[PDB]
Amino acid sequence: PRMPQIRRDITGLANLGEVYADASPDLFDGLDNAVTTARTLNEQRGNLDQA
Amino acid sequence: NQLDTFTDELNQQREEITRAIDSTNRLLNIVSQRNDTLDRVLTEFPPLIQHFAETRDLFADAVTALGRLSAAADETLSGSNANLHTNLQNLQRPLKQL
Amino acid sequence: QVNSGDAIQRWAANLNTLAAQSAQNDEALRSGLQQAAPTADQLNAVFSDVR
Amino acid sequence: STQVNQLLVNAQTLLAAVNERGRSVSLLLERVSSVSRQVEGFVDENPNLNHV
Amino acid sequence: VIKNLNTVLDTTVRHQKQFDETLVNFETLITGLKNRADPIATSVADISD
Amino acid sequence: TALNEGRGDFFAVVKSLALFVNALHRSDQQFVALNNDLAQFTNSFTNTDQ
């Protein structure tokens, strides 16, 4: 009885995978640079709190 | 009988299953080739998020205090832009002659 | 998530751009924090003197 | 999972509340850069202020 | 799919403790900010203005 | 045999994902709103290149 819902889930999974594949490289480059600035912030946690 | 119905329903979605497999393959390939970025994220972001959660109240207080200052500053500098400009423009000559 | 594909792609690209800009000025960010720590204290002192 | 759901809904609420003032948030960086430049120029171009 | 998913999942498992703690910490931070969102948004707009 | 050796882990996955989806499924429109608001908020800082 839940087979149309299975079809909907499969189609949505395919579409979401395609969208995530399209958007992934930008996200991962941003994550690399965000790790850079996050290490920057972590090295000066005390300075940020004082600020 | 139920297996017949279930197998018919699954076979009717073979193209969608293949497309989902291909899409998941592409996404997982991109993520696997950025696994280094994933490791670098998971090594250094959780401490930052934890410390931010530790000092959320202080950050909110700082933002609110700066906003309290900036609202009054904005009202003062918007209610006294043109008037100050005109007063300076008019007072230039008395200043020079003095 | 599928119906909002354009939005997630757009904010992924914008996160990439913002993170790149923030990482390319890492020394600028560190200097900004290190100078923002005592300058607000000095401004507070100046204002509290003419309170 | 409860934390994830609460995080997502609170993030939606926070972003909706922040970006309703779209014009000012959309110009915060431009205006802070502009005022930084103006203050720098004002201090630079008036070196006789201390003696005054 | 199996190879790449296994790689990513073992990468996450290596940081399982941190990945578990970061969800709780992020939820706490987001809730604390949402409880004051309107003053925070007003303050940001006032700073920009 | 391969599935049966990992059967316990697989059904633990099924139960955990059931908990996750049952606790997150009610806010689908709020998730769409979150994504749109995040896109707008990020657009608020990337109008120009620098």
Q: Which residues of E touch D34 (CB under 8 A)?
A: none
Spatial contact of B52 and E25, defined as CB atoms under 8 Å apart: yes
Angle between helices D2-18 and F28-43 (to 10 degrees): 40
**Residue of C2, C3, C9, C14 to mutate, testing the F interface (most F Cβ within 10 Å of its Cβ):** C14
The residue length of chain A stands at 51
Task: Kindly report the number of other CB atoms within 10 A of residue E20's CB atom.
Answer: 10
- Residue from the list E4, E12, E22 with its beta carbon closest to the beta carbon of B32: E4
Look up tokens 């299975």; give the residue.
A6
Query: Element (H or E) spanning C46, and its range?
Result: helix C26-49
Structure tokens, D5: 């759901």
DSSP chain B: -HHHHHHHHHHTTHHHHHHHHHHHHHHHHHHHHTHHHHHHHHHHHHHHHHHHHHTHHHHHHHHHHHHHHHHHHHHHHHHTSHHHHHHHHHHHHHHHH-
Dist CA A28 CA B36 (whole Å): 10
Residue from C21, B46, B37 nearest A32 by CA = B37
How far is the alpha carbon of A51 from chain B, nearest alpha carbon, in Å? Answer: 9
Structure tokens, E12: 């996450």
Dist CA C41 CA C46 (whole Å): 9
Q: Which residues of A touch B54 (CB under 8 A)?
A: none
Q: Do chains C and E touch (3 or more CB pairs under 8 A)?
A: no
Residue from B52, D27, A25, B47 nearest C17 by CA = A25
Resolution in A: 2.8
Dist CA D29 CA F33 (whole Å): 25
DSSP state, residue F27: G
CA angle, corner F42, sides to D39 and B54, nearest 5?
Answer: 85
Name where chain B breaks: residue before each gap, C-N > 2.5 Å.
Answer: none
Dist CA F6 CA B19 (whole Å): 26
Spatial contact of A28 and C13, defined as CB atoms under 8 Å apart: no
Residue contact E12–B42, C-beta within 8 A? yes
Residues in CB range of C6: below 8 A, 6 or more apart: F39
Dist CA B11 CA B3 (whole Å): 12
